[PDB]
From a paper:
The bile acid-sensitive ion channel (BASIC) is the least understood member of the mammalian epithelial Na+ channel/degenerin (ENaC/DEG) superfamily of ion channels, which are involved in a variety of physiological processes. There is, however, a conserved architecture among other members of the ENaC/DEG superfamily. These trimeric channels resemble a chalice in which a large extracellular domain (ECD) connects to a slender transmembrane domain (TMD) via linkers at the membrane interface. In this study, we used single-particle cryo-EM to determine the structure of hBASIC in the membrane-like environment of lipid nanodiscs, confirming its global adherence to the canonical ASIC fold. By determining structures in the presence and absence of Ca2+, we identified a single Ca2+-bound, non-conducting conformation of hBASIC, as well as both conducting and non-conducting conformations of Ca2+-free BASIC, revealing unexpected Ca2+-dependent conformational changes.
To reveal how hBASIC responds to Ca2+ removal, we prepared grids of hBASIC reconstituted in nanodiscs in the presence of 2 mM EGTA to chelate ambient Ca2+o and analyzed the sample using single-particle cryo-EM. The overall resolution of both classes was lower than hBASIC in the presence of Ca2+, with both class 1 and class 2 having a global resolution of ~3.4 Å. In accordance with the electrophysiology data, we observed two distinct particle classes that differ in their pore conformations, which we thus refer to as ‘EGTA-closed’ (class 1), representing a non-conducting state, and ‘EGTA-open’ (class 2), representing an expanded, conducting state. In hBASIC, Ca2+ removal induces a rotation of TM1 and TM2a away from the three-fold axis, resulting in a 4 Å helical displacement of TM1 and a 6° rotation of TM2a. EGTA-closed resembles the Ca2+-closed conformation whereas EGTA-open is dramatically reorientated such that the positions of the L425 and N426 side chains are switched; N426 now facing the vestibule and L425 making contacts with the β1-β2 linker. This is reminiscent of the conformation seen in the MitTx-bound open structure of cASIC1a41. Removal of Ca2+ triggers a 4 Å lateral displacement of the β1-β2 linker, repositioning the tyrosine residue and promoting rearrangement of the β11-β12 linker to open the pore. Removal of Ca2+ leads to rotation of the TM2 helix, displacing these residues from the center of the pore and expanding the extracellular vestibule. The gate is significantly widened in the EGTA-open structure, having a pore radius greater than 2 Å, which is sufficient to accommodate partially dehydrated Na+ ions. Removal of Ca2+ causes rearrangement of this loop to displace the histidine and increase the pore-radius from ~1 Å to ~3 Å.
Numbering used by the authors:
A (entry chain A), B (entry chain B), C (entry chain C): 38 to 213, 224 to 471
The structure:
Amino acid sequence: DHDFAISTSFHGIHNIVQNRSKIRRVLWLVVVLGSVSLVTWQIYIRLLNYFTWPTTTSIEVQYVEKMEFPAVTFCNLNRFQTDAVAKFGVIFFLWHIVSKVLHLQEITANSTGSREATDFAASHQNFSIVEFIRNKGFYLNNSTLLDCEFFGKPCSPKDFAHVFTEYGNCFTFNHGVSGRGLSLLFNVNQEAFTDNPALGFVDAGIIFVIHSPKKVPQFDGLGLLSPVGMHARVTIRQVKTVHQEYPWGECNPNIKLQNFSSYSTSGCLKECKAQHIKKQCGCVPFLLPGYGIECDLQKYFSCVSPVLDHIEFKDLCTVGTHNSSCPVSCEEIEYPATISYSSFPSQKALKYLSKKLNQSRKYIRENLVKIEINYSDLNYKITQQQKAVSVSELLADLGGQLGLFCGASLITIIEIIEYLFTNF
Amino acid sequence: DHDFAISTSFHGIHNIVQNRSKIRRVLWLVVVLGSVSLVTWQIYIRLLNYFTWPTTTSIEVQYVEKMEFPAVTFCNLNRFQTDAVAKFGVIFFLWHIVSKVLHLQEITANSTGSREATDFAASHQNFSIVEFIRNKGFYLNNSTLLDCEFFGKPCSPKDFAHVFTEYGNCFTFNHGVSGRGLSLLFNVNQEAFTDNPALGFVDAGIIFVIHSPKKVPQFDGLGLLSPVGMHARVTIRQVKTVHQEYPWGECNPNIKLQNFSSYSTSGCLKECKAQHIKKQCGCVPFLLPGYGIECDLQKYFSCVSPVLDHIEFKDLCTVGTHNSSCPVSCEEIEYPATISYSSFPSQKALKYLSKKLNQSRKYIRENLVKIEINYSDLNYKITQQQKAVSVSELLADLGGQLGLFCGASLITIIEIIEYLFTNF
Amino acid sequence: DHDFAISTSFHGIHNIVQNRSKIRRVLWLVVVLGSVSLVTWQIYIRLLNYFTWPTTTSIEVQYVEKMEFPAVTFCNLNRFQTDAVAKFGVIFFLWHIVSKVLHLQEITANSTGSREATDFAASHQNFSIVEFIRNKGFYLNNSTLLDCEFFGKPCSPKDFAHVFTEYGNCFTFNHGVSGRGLSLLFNVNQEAFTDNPALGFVDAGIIFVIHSPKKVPQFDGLGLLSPVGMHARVTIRQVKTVHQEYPWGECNPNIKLQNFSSYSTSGCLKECKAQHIKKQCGCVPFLLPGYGIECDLQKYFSCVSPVLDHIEFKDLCTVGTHNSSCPVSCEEIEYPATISYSSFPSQKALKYLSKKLNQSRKYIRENLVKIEINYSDLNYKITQQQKAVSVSELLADLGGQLGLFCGASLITIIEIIEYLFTNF
C-alpha cells in the first residue's frame, strides 16, 4: 500500500514521498485535503447555480428588403343605424347583455333598461340578435370608404373581411418598402349612425387595432383611436419576443388549441371561457367561434351572465405565469405605434371635397377621417430569452472548479481506489 | 537537489529526467518557462479585465394577474379664478417670482410687472401668497369633475389629494385587471378660470403626470397634455430599472433623505436646493416640504431669487454621474405612455350633455375634457445591470489561464520551494 | 520504450505501471483513450461554436449634465404661394415629376396633367424649376415665424438654414438642461399658400423631422405632423446603437462617401442613386448634392424617370443586410418621440392674439401652430453588439475542454513524441 500511496499522482502525495518526514508528510496531506475540499466547494456552488435553471437575454436588430405588413381591423365608434334603432331602443341593452362575453363589465339588474330587455326576451325568444346586427350595424361600401391604397395601388371594399366584435360589424384588412404603407379615407356619417350616450360611447371617430394576420383582435382598452376632422399618421415597427420552457421561463408548448389552431394567449383564454360556458350551460355565445350550439337569447340572461360572474369571482381563468391556465406563448409579435396629427380639411381642399361629395361645408369637417399606417424601419427587433447553461456546458465548467487547486481528474479517483484497498 | 528537481512534478522537469541530455534538458526547461510565462500572461490579462469592474445587462418580462396602478396628478392649464384676479393683476408676476423654485426661468428685472410686484411687496409684506392661492386657485368639486371611475366603480372628489405645483392647486389620485383603468370627465370652464397670455399659457386643457404613489410630481416639460373637446386614450406599461454601486454602475445607496424618506433623484435634488437656500438665507419657500420657517415675501425678491441665480450659475447642484451631488437611485420605475384621440362630443351625445348640464351647445364643445388611462399589458419590463464577475468567479477563472499550459496548481509552488532551497 | 512509456506523465499510464497486469494495463489505457477522446470532442464543439462568430448584446443608460440637442427640419404642408400658381397650374405636375428622385411614386403617363407638363417642357426647355421654387415656395420671416425660443433665449429666422425637400423650401434648425428645449409659433397662412387637392395634400399644418446635426432629412412617411389650432408637446430621448463587422454583425466600415462625408445609410443610398443616374444619363437632379451638371428639364421626362423605374424594377439599390449595396452604419442615433396635444387659442388668449396680430377671430384658429420639443432625461440609452469570443478567449476556453478529463497540456504531446518513437 505504501508503494501505491507514494506512487499516487498527487502534489501532496508526491511531496509526502519527497520529504520523507512525519511533519512534512502530514503538512502536505493536509494541504491536499484542503485543496480538494475547496474543489468540492466550488463544484457544489456552481452546480447549485446550474440548478437555478439560469437565463441570459439577447436583443438584436434584424433586416429584410421587403417585410410582411400586419393586418388591421377597423370599427365605427357609433354602432347602429339611426333608422333601425329609433323605435327599438331596447336593442342597446340587449347588445350590452350579449357582449358580456367580451367586455366583462357589470350591469345593474334593477335598471329600467334591464327590465325592458328582460321583458322583450320573455316575449320574443325566437328573435335572433346576430342576424339583426349583421344587417343594421355598421357597413362598408362606396358610401363609407371613400378611398383606400395599400402600396400605391388602389384598394376596394371587397378586400375587407368581416368580423364581429364589441362594436359590431368590425372589418379587417390584409387577412390571412420602407416609410410606405396603407392609407384610407372613411365617411363616419353621424347622420346615419348613432349610439346611446347613456351607456357612454359619447365620442365619434374610427377605432382600430393592429395584429398579426392569423390572430383575432381584442380591442377593449387596447384599441387605438382616430378623431373626426384630422389626418392621423401612424408609424410602426415589428417587435418579436421569444421565451423558454417552464424551468427557464414560462412557455408551455404542450398546450394546443381546438380545431388545430396555433397557440395564442388570447386564444387560450377565450377557448377556456367557451369550454367553461359550454360545459356548465350547454351552449356557446355568438361572439366566439363555432364550438357548437349557439345559445338562445333567454340563456344570456338566465345562464351566461351568472356563469361569467362566477368565472370572474372564482378566478377560474388566469393568464401569464407558468402555473396559470393560459401560459405565455413561445413567441409573440407586437406592433408598437406612435401617432401624429394634422388638420385634414385644408380650406383649399375643403371646397374641392365639397364639390366631389356634393356635401355641405358643415358636413365634411363633422364626418371625414383620414388614416395612414406606415413602417418606420425595414429592420425589426427580436428579443430572445436563452438558457444560460447547457448540459454540455456543465461538463466544461465542472472541470473548472478543480482549476487553481490540485490539478487532477482521474488521479483523485485513482487515489480513491488506493484508499479503498487501503481501508479494506 | 538533483533528486528533488528530477522528482518535481512538471512536464518539462519530467522530460529533463527522461531525456538525460544537456540539449534535451535545456529545451524542455525552456518550453516549461514559456508555458508558465503564457500562464502568467493570461492570468494578468484576466485580472486587469476583472479590475475594470465589468457589467452585463439583462432585460426580462415579468407577470402578475392584478398589478398596482400608478398615481396620477391633474392640473388646470388656466391658473386663477377670473373674478379674484381681474382687479389684482400683479398676482401673475408675484406667482411667477414665487415659483422660481420650480420653473427656474429668468425674469427681466426692468419689466413693468416686476416693478409693480416689488412695490406691492414693499407695501403689503404681511400678505400671504399661499393662503391666497389655495383659495382663489383651481378647485375640484361636483362643478368641475363631472365623472370619475377607477375600475368600473364610481369615484368622487374626496378621493383626490391636494398638492401645490407650478400651476397651483394640483390634485392627485391614488395617493399612498388588464386593458382596464381610470376614466374621467373634467369641466375646464374657461368662463371662470383664466391666465395671463403675456407670460404664455395661451393654451387651454388638462395637464397631467404619471408617477409612483410615493413620489412627488415634477411637471415642467415632462408633463402630458389633453385638449378641450377630444377624448384622450392613454395606454401605459410599467418599466423598472436596476443599477449597481459606484465601482460597477452609479448608484450610491449610502445617501438618505431627511425625514427618513426613501431615496429619489428628484427628492435629492430638491432637498439639496432647500438646504442651500435655508443655510444661505435662513428660510424656505412654500413649494417645498416643511423644513422650517416659511420665507417672507420680501425675501423672495431680496434673498431667494439671487440665491437661485447663484446656484444655477455655480452648478452647486448636479444630477446623474457617480461624482454628482444627486446620484441615480438604486432602482427606478417609469411609465411610458402612448396617446390616441377621438372627437369627444358626438352630435348625438352633444344634445344629451347639453340637456344634462343645462349648458349651451357652444359651451360644452369649448370646455369639456375626457381622459382614460389604461394598463396595456399585465406584464412589466425589468432591466438589471449585473456585476459580471464575483470574487468567487475570479477563483474559478484564475484556473483557466493555466489551462492549455503546464497543468499544475501546487506543483509550480512545489518547484518554487525546490528552487528556493536550490538557490539558498 | 517501456521505461519512457511507464514514466510518461498520464493517469492511465501511471496506472499501467502501478498495476503491472495485462487486464489492468488494458483497462487504464482504454480509460485514458476515452478521456482524451472526450477532451477532443469538447474541444471541437467549442471551436465550431467560436467559428459561428457569436455575439452578445449589452444595453445601458449613459448620463451628462448638458447634452447636445438634435437638429430639426420644418416644412409647410402647403407648397406654393397662391398668387404665383393660380395661372400656372402645370407647376404641380412639373414638381411631381421632378421629385420622383425622392418620392419614388408612379404617375400615369396618360393623365392630362402629364400631357400639359410634357407640352410645357417641349415649349420652355430653358425654364429653371429650382430658381422658381426657391422664390415662389414657402418662406420664413417675421410674417411666418411669430416666435422662437431655444433655451429661454430669443431666436430669429436668420438662425434657420435652408434646405430643399419634397415640399420645397424646407428650413432646418441647429444645423452643424433637462425638461427644457426648443419652442415655436408658426403662422401657416392658408390665405397665401396652397396646394393641389387632386394630388392629395388635402391636409394643413407643419411637418417636421428630428435628425442628427450632420445628416440630411428624409421625410417621406417618416415625418412627424402637427395640426393647426393645437399646441403640440413633443418629448424625446436620444437612442444610440452600435454594430460589429461582417463576421459578427453587418457593419462594413470600409465604404466611404464621396466628398469625404461620414458614412450614413441614407447617404449611401442616395449617393448610389446619383451614381447610377449620372453614369447612365450623364446628369444629376437638383434635389441631390452638387455631383456635377444639373439635368435639363426635358431629361426628367426622357431620361431620369425611365432610369428610376428601371432602378426600382431591377433592385439595383439595396439597404441593410451584409451583402446589400447600402450596409448598416457602424453606429446610429435615433430620436423616438411621444406627442401630446392641447387646445392652442385659449378664449382669453384668443382676443389677445387677435389684437396683437390685428387678425380676425376666424383667422387665428384657422392658421396658427405652436410646437415644443423637449428632452425627457439628461440620460440616453446605448445598445452595443459585442463579439462574444476574442482570440485570446479561445485560448482560455481551449483549456477548459481538457478540464474534468485527463489533466494535461504538454504530457499528451510528450506521450505523442513517445508514441512517435515507439512507432518509428
